[PDB]
Design a protein around this nucleic acid. Structure first.
Lengths: 255, 121, 388, 241
RNA sequence: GCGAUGAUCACCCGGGUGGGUACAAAUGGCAGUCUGACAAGU
RNA sequence: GAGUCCCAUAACCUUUGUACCCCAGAGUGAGAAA
């Protein structure tokens, strides 16, 4: 089936990382290039997309007096940029310059729009190739796990211990050879469930979640007649949440 | 106002060219704008002499910026034709520099002109 | 005998009234020097009576220039008229303490009945107001004296330097970093369009190696199964049939091992291909802006070697000012890593470097550079060219 | 010596805001306010800090007389983080940029210059450094730019003029706080080349006392400069006795 | 019918070896994917 | 029980491919041509 081919996932996650790198570089320079005209914006508004949208709505500091930034910025942020506009140390630019800076800004929002589109595309792909895994670990971390092994089947044949420390080979094999303690989170650290845990419980939940991830993953890979529902993932998720609740309920301090 | 500034008067130009010629004999003179820039970079220049009728004058206007960043006296003489003749070469010279040397035979004359140029600036 | 004090703030003009007169003979004694520092003692000396803020940034610069030249602005004339009481020109005159003596004669002309004092006693009161600043204004809206100084400081400085955007060359430096960056990303994303559409129909990746040609064709041939004679003519219009690809695509579309991808997958390829199309279009637009901008900034350097080559030379130096200040030898090794200027071949390279250096100097230090000298300078290189 | 690929150890200097880069050779360095570019082509040192990439700029003693003072071992330097400094005779960013690094974002530097040609790059640099306020005006007439300067903790003067003592006194009286700092660079030749350097230095110190500035220490800038000295003083309005 | 606005200044048999800068790819190497039955409450 | 936190989403080495390079470098500084 065209909807159950995993090489799309490995390509999408690699592309998604590259898009984040490219969009960042263009944004830094739009801050520098337009910052020449108005250097105070970068300190006030840090978000790249919000920064770019300001250039589109208002081009020049003179326009700041009448232009409204309500939809882009809150009330307190929008007034600050207006005040900086008149006391700005920047120079004036020609409409020839303004046209190309707007052209750069339009590329920022277009890239931001498409990056959202790719993220939703990957979510749809992950929910059709491994619906059970997505329910437990999530679309983003799940996609990386598949990409790391290179194939869903390859990940399916790995034991739960490997999946726990899949992304931390550098620390693992250093520690193994030098007789020191090994990592306990790997790439799974960014799963939502691990975030909810605290203290030493994070290591325990990683062990519990990795064990259940292998259960839900193997069902995705090796099931001939899998329903695209994630039922195994949902019930697997409930067990880990119950484990977290009783794990987090306990208090070490004597009461 | 004019880009070439200060421009030495007739009395001062005559004195400046005297030092330039004696420096040429004693191998204490570097000729040409490219040489003048190098000496400024090495910080081995007593002062810089430039021609005010260089065509265009802008091809030597970098030297004043280098000089007054480095606090080196500089002065413009009206004629590149005369400056080249004093330098001892058979071509016009637009810029020249007097090399730093505390063991030179013409120390007193050089410092005599350098004090005058400083007053002019 | 001081009765009023004038203080000029970046936000506006402030007038104070002297309640007590500090000791004159004992002015140099330590205790009278300390009371200037102590706010509890100082507040017994003076009190704020009036404050007239400037309307905006433009007015502040105008009055700063007037104050710099010892002139009375229309704003200053208004505040003094409102506050200072009328007195005789001869019998008795209101005394005003001002920081600048050059401003004294100007105030006298506008107001014959006010006498300006700028002796050391006045300076001490001015020093105290400057020391305590906003604390003496009793909460009156003076904005922030530290931010206004920074804006007014840049404004006042550049006005004297006549700093202009025409001289600006940083636009050139950024656009180079865009152009090569766009080329890398266009090539990078274009290649990814090959693989994604390579899965669906690999043979096309062989047919039209030109990268920009795939996307427009992939935008058209979304599904290889769709093969119509009219579509063949439509894709035949794309590029030319001289290569024969228009027939090959129809044939290979009928016979290929490519696995069909989902509708959502194709939606990404065309959209991702569409993004690459925009960047190439934007890159061409920017490259034209560079050609125009360079002619404005460095016409001599641009004409001698070219707009793009000169821009890369400017960026390597870091600024047109840096390139001008470099010697002839340094410029040659500045472009010796990318072969910008490239035994007889080297001699032309060294010769062109010297000419490029002079061209930069004319461009850098001229308010409105012309291309007259760059043209003849290139011609001089052209005469050198055939000789060797 | 200090080549590209070599690695160095950065440790703090006795003066706040100044650092030492150890190795086969020691380098005086300052943390870069505007990372990623050099204002006058100095070497730069990058450290990966948890990771953000911080940068440090090498301070060349042979180019900046203030750096020569730090090398020579000045006991007290009023230039420190979070202080306002009035820099007189700011030809360009060779020394002002380093001073801007020491004061840091919280501090400010009022760069004063007269010649328009060096001023233009002073503007160009200052737009990279938000804490620098370039004042293209003669230091001989502080009344012209009184609007632009508030009270300053320290006054640094590198003006090479024969009557710089008058320039220092006027600026200190208007803008320097009581008990504030004064750091002067004196070149014997510019003031009076007729007499020896020592007579000039003794004469300038007397002028500073007359203007209610107490000299604290004196240092000569050899081997970095000849017939140069830095005088560090405190502005004691109340009394020097 | 010149010039300081700048003169002058690796190897082997037409062919093959040696060295250098930049970028891309490798299902090429380093390189080998932690432990395994108790824990928490009254 | 157990180092995510030294980017295995990586660095370095090797092979292959593409495009350029074999003069000095803070280059030198009055010769060249006859």
């Amino acid at each position: 089936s065209a909807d159950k081919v995993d090489v799309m996932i490995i390509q999408a996650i690699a592309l998604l990382d590259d898009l984040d790198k490219e969009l960042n570089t263009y944004a830094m320079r739009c801050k520098e290039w337009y910052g020449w005209h108005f250097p105070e914006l970068a300190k006030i508004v840090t978000d790249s997309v919000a920064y770019a949208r300001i250039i589109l709505t208002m081009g020049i500091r003179s326009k700041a007096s009448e232009t409204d930034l309500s939809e882009i910025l809150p009330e307190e942020i929008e007034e600050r940029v207006k005040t900086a506009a008149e006391v700005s140390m920047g120079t004036e630019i020609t409409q020839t310059d303004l046209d190309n800076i707007n052209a750069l800004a339009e590329q920022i929002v277009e890239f931001a729009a498409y990056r959202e589109q790719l993220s939703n595309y990957l979510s749809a792909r992950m929910k059709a190739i491994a619906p059970n895994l997505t329910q437990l670990v999530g679309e983003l971390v799940g996609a990386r796990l598949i990409a790391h092994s290179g194939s869903l089947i390859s990940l399916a044949k790995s034991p739960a211990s490997t999946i726990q420390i899949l992304g931390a080979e550098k620390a693992l094999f250093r520690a193994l050879k030098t007789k020191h303690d090994t990592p306990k989170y790997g790439l799974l650290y960014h799963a939502s469930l691990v975030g909810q845990a605290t203290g030493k419980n994070k290591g325990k939940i990683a062990r519990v979640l990795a064990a259940k991830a292998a259960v839900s993953l193997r069902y995705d890979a090796l099931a001939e007649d899998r329903d695209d529902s994630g039922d195994i993932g949902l019930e697997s998720r409930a067990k880990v949440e119950n484990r977290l609740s009783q794990l987090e309920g306990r208090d070490l301090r004597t009461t | 106002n004019p880009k070439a500034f200060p421009l030495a008067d007739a009395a001062l130009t005559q004195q400046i060219l005297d030092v330039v010629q004696q420096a040429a004999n004693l191998r204490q003179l570097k000729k040409g704008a490219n040489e003048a820039t190098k000496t400024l970079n090495r910080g081995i220049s007593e002062f810089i002499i430039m021609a005010a009728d260089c065509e265009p004058i802008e091809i030597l206007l970098h030297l004043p910026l280098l000089c007054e960043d480095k606090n080196v006296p500089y002065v413009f003489v009206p004629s590149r034709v005369a400056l080249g003749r004093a330098c001892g070469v058979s071509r016009p010279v637009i810029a020249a520099s007097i090399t730093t040397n505390d063991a030179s035979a013409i120390k007193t004359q050089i410092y005599a002109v350098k004090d005058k140029i400083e007053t002019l600036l | 005998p001081i009765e009023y004090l004038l203080f000029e703030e970046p936000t506006g003009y402030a007038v104070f009234k002297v309640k007590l007169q500090q000791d004159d003979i004992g002015s140099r004694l330590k205790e009278v020097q300390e009371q200037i520092n102590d706010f509890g003692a100082f507040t017994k000396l003076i009190e704020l009576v009036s404050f007239a803020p400037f309307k905006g940034a433009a007015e502040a610069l105008e009055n700063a220039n007037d104050i710099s030249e010892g002139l009375v602005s229309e704003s200053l004339k208004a505040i003094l008229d409102l506050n200072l009481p009328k007195a005789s020109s001869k019998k008795k005159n209101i005394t005003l303490a001002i920081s600048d003596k050059n401003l004294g004669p100007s105030i006298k002309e506008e107001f014959p009945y006010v006498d300006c004092i700028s002796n050391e006693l006045a300076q001490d009161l001015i020093r105290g107001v400057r020391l305590h600043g906003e604390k003496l204004f009793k909460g009156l809206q003076s904005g922030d004296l530290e931010r206004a100084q920074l804006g007014l400081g840049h404004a006042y400085s550049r006005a004297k330097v006549k700093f202009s955007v025409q001289k600006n060359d940083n636009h050139i430096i950024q656009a180079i970093a865009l152009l090569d960056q766009l080329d890398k990303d266009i090539n990078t994303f274009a290649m990814r369009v090959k693989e994604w559409y390579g899965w669906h129909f690999p043979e096309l990746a062989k047919l039209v190696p030109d990268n920009y040609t795939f996307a427009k064709l992939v935008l058209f041939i979304k599904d290889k199964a769709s093969l119509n004679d009219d579509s063949l003519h439509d894709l035949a219009a794309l590029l030319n049939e001289d290569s024969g690809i228009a027939q090959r695509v129809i044939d290979n579309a009928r016979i290929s091992m490519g696995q069909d991808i989902s509708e959502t997958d194709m939606e990404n390829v065309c959209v991702f291909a569409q993004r690459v199309a925009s960047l190439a279009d934007y890159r061409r637009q920017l490259y034209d802006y560079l050609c125009e901008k360079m002619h404005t900034v460095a016409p001599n350097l641009s004409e001698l070697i070219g707009e793009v080559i000169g821009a890369r030379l400017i960026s390597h130096a870091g600024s047109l000012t840096n390139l001008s200040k470099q010697a002839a030898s340094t410029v040659q090794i500045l472009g010796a890593e990318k072969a910008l200027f490239r035994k007889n071949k080297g001699r032309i390279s060294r010769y062109l470097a010297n000419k490029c250096s002079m061209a930069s100097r004319i461009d850098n230090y001229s308010e409105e550079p012309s291309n007259v000298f760059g043209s003849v300078l290139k011609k001089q290189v052209e005469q050198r060219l055939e000789f060797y | 010596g200090a080549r590209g690929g070599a690695k160095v150890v950065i440790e703090p200097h006795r003066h706040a805001g100044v650092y030492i880069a150890r190795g086969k050779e020691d380098l005086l360095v300052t943390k870069n306010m505007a990372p990623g570019e050099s204002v006058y082509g100095e070497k730069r040192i990058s450290v990966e800090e948890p990771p953000t990439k911080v940068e440090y700029r090498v301070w060349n003693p042979f180019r900046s007389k203030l750096a020569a003072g730090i090398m020579g071992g000045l006991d007290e330097l009023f230039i420190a983080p979070g202080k306002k400094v009035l820099y007189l005779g700011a030809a360009s960013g060779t020394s002002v940029s380093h001073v801007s690094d020491v004061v840091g974002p919280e501090g400010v530097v009022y760069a004063v210059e007269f010649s328009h040609r060096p001023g233009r790059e002073l503007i160009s640099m200052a737009k990279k450094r938000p804490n620098i306020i370039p004042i293209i005006e003669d230091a001989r007439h502080p009344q012209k730019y009184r609007m632009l300067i508030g009270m300053v903790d320290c006054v640094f003067a590198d003006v090479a003029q024969p009557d710089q003592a008058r320039i220092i006194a006027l600026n200190s009286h208007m803008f320097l706080k009581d008990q504030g700092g004064v750091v002067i660079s004196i070149k014997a030749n510019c003031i009076d080349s007729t007499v020896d350097a020592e007579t000039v230095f003794a004469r300038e110190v007397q002028k500073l006392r007359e203007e209610r500035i107490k000299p604290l220490e004196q240092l000569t800038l050899e081997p970095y400069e000849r017939d140069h000295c830095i005088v560090v003083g405190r502005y004691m309005r109340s009394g020097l006795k």
